[PDB]
Subunit: 504 residues, 3 copies
């Protein structure tokens, strides 16, 4: 079986950057059953004293998530943060216009902090810029982070949390560009609004890391021009611009081969997407004569099948089944390739949020009063979150090219190498994006300043096979058949495959 | 006469549209004595269990009002709707900057619902866009129309109203264009504000009929461009555009003959005015590649003598003073008769109209403190149209002598509309004589509607056109029986400055 | 001595204007120790029943302040006015973002009203336009000035103040052009906002006199064009436009003679400032075919060494790498407590002269600030209150500049500066009451190392009195808490003539 592809590290290889732990973040929203029926369900036997599903907490810890975006999302644009603080019996029942739901407010910032303490995760808190603004954000900042003595911080102490929450990263609103967003703004309206909010919050606390919300996606007419205006205006007090990208097989219902191969090449779309958002952030620095680069926050990424999209007297539903996609092995392979692209570009991308954490387009599914189980997309993320440490390296890759209808000629193999020169352990993530042809792969890790370890392979001959509640282990990573020959080792990666290989 | 003018419903007669019930709407503002000493007077001998004047309620039923705009008007721009819910003893006393008054808040949305339930009228609810905006609008929308279970809707149940109030038609603020309005906005600001509000409300309840406010009048500098900018931006979540037109005899002090002739032809301004606003509404649809038409909500119309409107350690602001209390002439009544003639002739685009205002306050209904309620001259044309204009509206073929005006060109002396309910075999003619000096005789050829009977035939005319109804003499000017002679084909004489209505089947 | 300079009236004048009493106003902000440990200190040996320091009040009277601006200033941009009303016990403890302090709210509009009653001073009330705006502005207006019988006014009555406070002059926001300001705006954003607020307030009360934010300084990139845009739109309901002018010796750390000479001629910046803002205010009137003039309000002026605060904001910005701060924000710390030199006083004397020379368009001025914070009055913890060098030129002008203001013909040898061109060394004003016989001349010597002698020839006005000299051989000599009266006005030695040493302010009363 002659090798036709090679992953090598040139001698004198300069790292892309240090791996930020924030690259392994996620995002929970008060949407569908992400919170209610997801992280919180008191009736469930696994639930703890606060009502958090322990089986989910186990899988989140296993998933390796470091930081979670909360509480939205479209939800936050008509949300009052005070409705989710204090004793639960005194919290008001409210509406959510975003998703046409009744909100019990059983979960709020109080309880999500308590959840985040158990989970061992940072909170990336989002403020309402739809129906509220500057005053409410400063109020929440004081309540959340304030030393005892001020009236807002004393409320927190009284609420059961004495210590500051230490929320360092903040989202100034949700995506305000979309017509669907409550309180949607023009490019200039949002520019001046983050200008006010960013300046104020930095004045109260200079140690904050602030995110201006970019476009809803690359599909927006204002895309590019949105980022430029906002970042140019508020450059001084910002640290992050957010960018969002979702991917799916367009011909999944017909199981078309062409659309499948397009979908497998989604990384080259993301690479191009990162470059242009980075470019917009560069133009804003240039116009300000600044020294610092505005980092990127990929706070919405993953696979989402979006092709599924008085006069009313009825009460609005509670905890509906929304955006609960079931993922294929193919889906997991592209999410494997997406994380590869994120790591290869972690010099600019310093944060990423896999949207979402539970139930809603998620790597974790929690059934309505049933068991919690790992989706296929769980496994590549979990491997990277646990073992992608130290410095990221963009490896020299010689690969045969596959033709795609959407993106043209694209390399069949793409990869990223991780190295921790004090452990002294490493990691290699690679994908075969070829839909028909397998490829034998050689690896030469010489340039690092080697011994094989646990090697995984995620592949199904039927790429449309999924995990279910009945069969939660129908597709799991299988032991990779790899032979070392000294220095260079070889492995055969089948059509539509993700592998991981740990080394020391 | 002998026949010198004719009204025919032949080929040259054009159908307008089905008569919308909302065209006979009115307007109740917290202004002067429209509410306090108008619809609400606890101490009055006719007061009900809630404090509402029963004698006023009976006249409102007689007037035929179907929908009431509430609570403003300039008043709403500095109003907090929560101040008008719950027990009256718990409600705060406030000041209203608009009309320089102190407001007891005894009447709120709570009470106006109860009043509207008894009156059988729809509520067109206006929200604050001056001192407040989006959040407050959504809060009130929930409190009013939300099902039990949510905090705001559970407040409404705790306040003694279990059922949702089902308010369907909403005004996003008031006339935000005028520099007299609290929180007045540029065309760009209001457009951006309405876009947000209209979207968020439709997202909450897709069954809403939302009204964006237009110019305060045709006189405004930003007229035309205002509606263009606002409607183009917010089109997808809008159902109505509001327009306002008040009219009066400019030389009423000197009893000028020239001014009286302009005032009598005021409908010709209204015709042009509607077309201009219809154009702005068409642009918004065409610019957004839409098929839904933005309807016109004439939420302020009527005769108002605005040239009189003075005015334009401390002291407490007055409670319910005597403001905008116009006593109407016979001429004022025929003008409003012709205005409703214009509205009905253009009820294809104008799907809502509101005569400003209902009680005491440029009104057809007057109510004296601890006294009786009586009809102004303007009551009678409105009440006839409101109760008998049903089915299809027709613009009939009019051949008429030309009367000369100053503010407009040479105008037809006679203007008319014909209502017709084909299935019920019953119709109505409403016609007017705009001539200030010479009488005219009409031929009424009703043959053409899809051949005999005539019913109540009324004529509102006074030899002295400046004659008024007052408190001491409530019935000095009233509609008299009309001399009609079917030969056929009917014929009737109209003296200078008169309004007529003839029922037929 | 040799006479070379001439201060004289051209036989037939023709004054600038009648001197407005509001020109001698000051400014109290919830900043540092201006309020707490300044005007308010309940445990102080001179504290009254309300807890106001009498020794401070005595010096306010002596200073001749007529109108005091409250409560801000940068402070007001993130301030909720209801937090400072009602019973002290139940007032919430709050953050101030502007100065990074925790605020107890022991002082509020209820209390400052009582202070202003005790002082005999008018109140110039500033409202939040940063975190808040229109609705709160109208709420405070009703609370403060409404007749009893409305919810907001009844609260004031219940809080111990039955009668309306009768606050005429209001500042709609603070320094909204400055990028340091909470909720800072563009020219268009503020124009729209001030138009809404000014109209609504004047609709509630015709008798109100409303101030729009102008430029925070002449250096501002939006200078001139800010005023033009803002005033053009909101013209009808505005009465004033605000001007802010701070000055200091940029090379005081080195004692550089070049920076000192630039600093002594700081009045030249103010002259241009006045000219440019007036022209902007003029074009707004004629754009609206208006009949009314917008007067100028120099509501923040004086000497302030802002490099100390500028270095604090840099160190705070560079502290971002260390992480988040858990420590509670300080209560009434020592902030902006500049100790004034003999030179600083002479500069303020000349600024007052320029203000008086242009009091035809500048009908109000507020010196920043009243106590402890860049102040003529310094007040020590549980101890004495004393006069700074800048106290004495203000007091004299405040207590004697009455009647009409005259700009006399000046002929003096010019001097060279880096910041400005060639400027006259001597600068002076004449104030004169025709009914009757008094009578004040204020003059300044701006030369840093050459003494001048001048001739005084009144004549054209339709025996001398008390004459004073503010000069020290060391122009860096200062009044301190230890020796508070080291720099005091000394008797002047004096058609009539007098000798003015390098860097000196003169006051001479006549009848």
């Amino acid at each position: 079986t002659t090798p036709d592809a090679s992953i090598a590290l040139n001698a004198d290889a300069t790292p892309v950057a240090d791996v930020p732990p924030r690259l392994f973040g996620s995002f929970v929203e008060h949407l569908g059953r992400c919170v209610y029926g997801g992280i919180y369900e008191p009736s469930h036997p696994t639930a703890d004293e606060n009502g958090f599903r322990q089986d989910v907490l186990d899988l989140v810890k296993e998933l390796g998530v470091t930081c979670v975006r909360y509480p939205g999302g479209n939800f936050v644009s008509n949300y009052n943060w005070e409705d989710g603080i204090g004793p639960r019996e005194n919290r008001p029942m409210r509406r959510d216009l975003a998703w046409h739901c009744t909100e019990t407010n059983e979960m709020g910032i109080d309880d999500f902090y308590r959840w985040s303490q158990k989970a061992g995760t940072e909170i990336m808190l989002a403020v309402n810029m739809g129906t509220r603004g500057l005053k409410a954000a400063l109020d929440e900042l004081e309540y959340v982070n304030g030393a005892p003595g001020t009236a807002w911080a004393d409320q927190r102490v009284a609420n059961g949390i004495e210590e500051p929450m230490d929320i360092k990263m903040w989202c100034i609103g949700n995506e305000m560009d979309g017509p669907w967003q409550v309180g949607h703004m023009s490019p200039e309206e949002y520019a001046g609004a983050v200008d006010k909010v960013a300046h104020a919050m930095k004045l109260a606390e200079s140690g904050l890391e602030l995110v201006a919300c970019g476009s809803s996606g690359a599909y927006m007419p204002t895309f590019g021009t949105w980022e430029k205006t906002v970042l140019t205006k508020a450059y001084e007090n910002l640290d992050f611009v957010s960018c969002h990208a979702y991917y799916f097989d367009r011909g999944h219902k017909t199981r078309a081969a062409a659309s499948m191969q397009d979908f497998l090449a989604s990384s080259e779309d993301m690479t191009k997407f990162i470059a242009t958002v980075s470019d917009a952030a560069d133009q804003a620095r240039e116009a300000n004569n600044g020294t610092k680069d505005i980092a990127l926050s990929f706070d919405e990424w993953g696979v989402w099948y979006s092709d599924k999209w008085g006069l009313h007297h009825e009460p609005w539903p509670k905890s509906p089944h929304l955006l609960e996609d079931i993922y294929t092995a193919a889906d997991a392979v592209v999410e494997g390739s997406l994380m590869i692209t994120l790591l290869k570009h972690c010099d600019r991308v310093r944060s990423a949020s896999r949207a979402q954490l539970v139930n809603v387009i998620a790597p974790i599914m929690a059934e309505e009063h049933g068991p919690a189980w790992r989706q296929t997309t769980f496994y590549p993320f979990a491997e990277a979150a646990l073992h992608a440490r130290g410095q990221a390296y963009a490896p020299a890759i010689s690969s045969p090219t596959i033709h795609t209808e959407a993106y043209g000629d694209v390399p069949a193999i793409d990869a990223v190498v991780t190295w921790d020169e004090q452990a002294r352990t490493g990691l290699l993530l690679a994908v075969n994006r070829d839909a028909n042809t397998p490829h034998t792969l050689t690896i030469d890790l010489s340039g690092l300043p080697l011994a094989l370890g646990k090697a995984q392979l995620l592949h199904e001959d039927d790429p449309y096979r999924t995990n279910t509640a009945e069969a939660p282990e129908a597709v799991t990573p299988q032991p990779l058949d790899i032979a070392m020959n000294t220095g260079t080792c070889t492995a055969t990666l089948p059509a539509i495959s993700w592998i991981s290989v740990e080394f020391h």
